């Protein structure tokens, strides 16, 4: 039985189907502590995300340049980017 506390630490075939049964409790405890320490912040509702459910499992890449530019609407609140109308009015007024 492994002495690790994280994922990808023990071969699922390590029981061999021949090991003694008294190790089952230690395996269940190991699995539970791993699941707990790998996601210690999961306390709110299940909050299913599934990585966008469609394609983001492969397209979500960030190595040397970002992609998937946001398609937000106008930001009349919290003035950020230079909305076209505002800058045009400012320029024509001076």
């Amino acid at each position: 039985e492994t002495n690790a506390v994280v994922i990808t630490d023990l071969n699922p075939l390590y029981p061999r189907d021949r090991d003694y049964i008294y190790e089952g409790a230690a395996q269940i405890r190991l699995i539970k502590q791993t699941l707990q320490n790998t996601f210690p912040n999961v306390t709110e509702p299940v909050d299913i995300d599934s990585d966008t459910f469609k394609i983001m499992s492969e397209k979500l890449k960030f190595t040397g340049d970002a992609m998937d530019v946001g398609g937000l609407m106008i930001k009349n609140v919290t003035p950020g980017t230079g909305d076209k109308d505002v800058v045009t009015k400012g320029q024509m007024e001076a």
Partner: protein
Amino acid sequence: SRGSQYILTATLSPANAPNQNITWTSSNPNIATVSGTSTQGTINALLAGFTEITATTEEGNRVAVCTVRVDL
């Protein structure tokens, strides 16, 4: 193996012994520690390195036994 702790039992020669008590001893307890009564409950810390689990009967003859753990 790593973490697994197997329980050992020590059946005294006579069926009963009054005022009996066991104080398990093992050289260099930093590898493992056991005490209490006939029930040992040996704990394992490392994945290798043999050990010599020997009994120490409080009462009765000091004569005890010896066991050789094998983590590998």
